[PDB]
């Protein structure tokens, strides 16, 4: 009934609110995508384009919520780049053990950080794992978490090591399914990391629109922005 271009006009305000709160680079990407939806000849184009807005915007608010840097996909570091710059003395071995699984070197998580020392820096990795584990324990939110560990080694108090934090996030209906497949994907490289004596933590989580607005991995004020924009776009897309 409603043409799609007309559908975008109606939600001009909610989408304006959305672009204004997103980080700068995330905002512009969502603004290009929005015009692709307005100028969409087919309802499959519009849908696929709206799927990208749902994920990209959500990531922008995940960055804001956690005070991490939003990284456009084009500029996201892979694992190989992380090992090379952060652990340069192990990269050659990191290349040898990936001879049979070369896709590992090209794994690109949503966030690839390291403890303060294009890998982003964070002051404490253990605190990020705790905050994830806390909310999982408190609101029943499904996560998966893994830590590399050479042999059965103990943590130590007389020296500091470099370490990575690998985080995957998502906005999609099958929350359980997302974290299981994410952790299955990274399990191989965790084991590789144990064998190279590199400390990594892998975290994965997801939200969906049925998640109570106080319980998401993003601030509730951002939950409201997504529900009032990207979620009404999807509902109006199907009906008309």
């Amino acid at each position: 009934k409603k043409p799609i271009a007309l559908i975008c006009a109606e939600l001009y305000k909610p989408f304006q609110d959305l672009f204004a709160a997103l980080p700068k680079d995330c905002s512009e990407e969502c603004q290009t995508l929005f015009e692709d939806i307005r100028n969409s000849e087919s309802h499959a184009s519009a849908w696929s384009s709206a799927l990208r807005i749902k994920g990209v915007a959500y990531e922008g608010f995940f960055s804001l919520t956690n005070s991490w840097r939003y990284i456009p996909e084009d500029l996201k570091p892979t694992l190989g780049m992380a090992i090379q710059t952060v652990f340069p003395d192990k990269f050659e071995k990191f290349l040898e053990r990936t001879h049979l699984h070369p896709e590992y070197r090209d794994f690109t998580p949503d966030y690839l950080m390291c403890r303060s020392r294009a890998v982003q820096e964070v002051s404490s990795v253990s605190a990020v794992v705790d905050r994830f584990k806390s909310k999982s324990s408190e609101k029943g939110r499904p996560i998966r978490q893994e830590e590399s560990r050479p042999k059965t080694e103990s943590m130590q108090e007389d020296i500091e090591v470099d370490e990575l934090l690998i985080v995957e996030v998502g906005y999609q209906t099958d929350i359980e399914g997302k974290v299981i497949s994410d952790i299955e994907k990274w399990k191989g490289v965790v084991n590789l990391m144990s064998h190279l004596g590199i400390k990594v933590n892998v975290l994965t989580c997801a939200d969906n629109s049925q998640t109570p607005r106080t319980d998401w991995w993003i601030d509730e004020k951002y939950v409201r922005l997504l529900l009032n924009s990207i979620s009404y776009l999807f509902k109006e897309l199907l009906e008309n």
Partner: antibody, heavy 118, light 113 residues
């Protein structure tokens, strides 16, 4: 001077429970991991449990897992060991210890004796 | 578990003589951070244990310099260069590279007479 001072020992029936405490002084307790070690009479030393400075990392000897809980209270410079489901094989001198900079046992208390028997 | 094997079980030694105690590990104690967490303790009769040497060869502050440690990987040695009467007691090695932390079974230093 660094000093560690255990208390809470005594006699426990098998299956019983008992909490030990270790009061620490002479160093900034909250910055260091703390440990429990025990020694059955006329036997060698046996590591029990470790707890990191901020309690985030805890390790247990396999023979106490699921029965013993280690914890600390940093504002009160006190280390705890909660023992439950005690067995006569848990009879031992219990020592708290710290590396004061590492995971080795640099500083030791005088120990407290726990006897598990009916 | 890491198994630590001390030899000899007992060591009779004359005052003034050197003593050597061996601790072997069932796997390497080199930690991935580059350190090697093998340590030596002395327990005098009726006392709690005291640290002598931490990470293979670092003498603990205040320990007499007759005590030294050496080795690497799975093979480590405590040496007493010149035994004194107060050195009577049980010597233990222990490792904290892997969990569980484990002790050797002890060497009893006996004074010859």
């Amino acid at each position: 001077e660094v000093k560690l001072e255990e208390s809470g020992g005594g006699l426990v029936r098998p299956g019983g429970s008992r909490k030990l405490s270790c009061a620490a002084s002479g160093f900034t307790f909250s910055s260091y991991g703390m440990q429990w070690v025990r020694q059955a009479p006329e036997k060698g030393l046996e590591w029990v449990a470790y707890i990191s400075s901020g309690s985030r990392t805890i390790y247990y000897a396999d023979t106490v897992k699921g029965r013993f809980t280690i914890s600390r209270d940093n504002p009160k410079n006190t280390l705890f060991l909660q023992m439950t489901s005690l067995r006569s094989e848990d009879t031992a001198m219990y020592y708290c210890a710290t590396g004061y900079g590492g995971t080795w046992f640099a500083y030791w208390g005088q120990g407290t004796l726990v006897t598990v028997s009916a | 578990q890491i198994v630590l094997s001390q030899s000899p079980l007992s060591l009779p030694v004359s005052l003034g003589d050197q003593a050597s105690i061996s601790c072997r590990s069932s796997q390497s104690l080199l930690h991935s951070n580059g350190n090697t967490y093998l340590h030596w303790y002395l327990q005098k009769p009726g006392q709690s244990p005291k640290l002598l040497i931490y990470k293979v060869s670092n003498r603990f502050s205040g320990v007499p310099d007759r005590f030294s440690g050496s080795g690497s990987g799975t093979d480590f040695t405590l040496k007493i260069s010149r035994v004194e009467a107060e050195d009577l007691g049980v010597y233990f090695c222990s490792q904290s590279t892997h969990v569980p932390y484990t002790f050797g079974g002890g060497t009893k230093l006996e004074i010859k007479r």
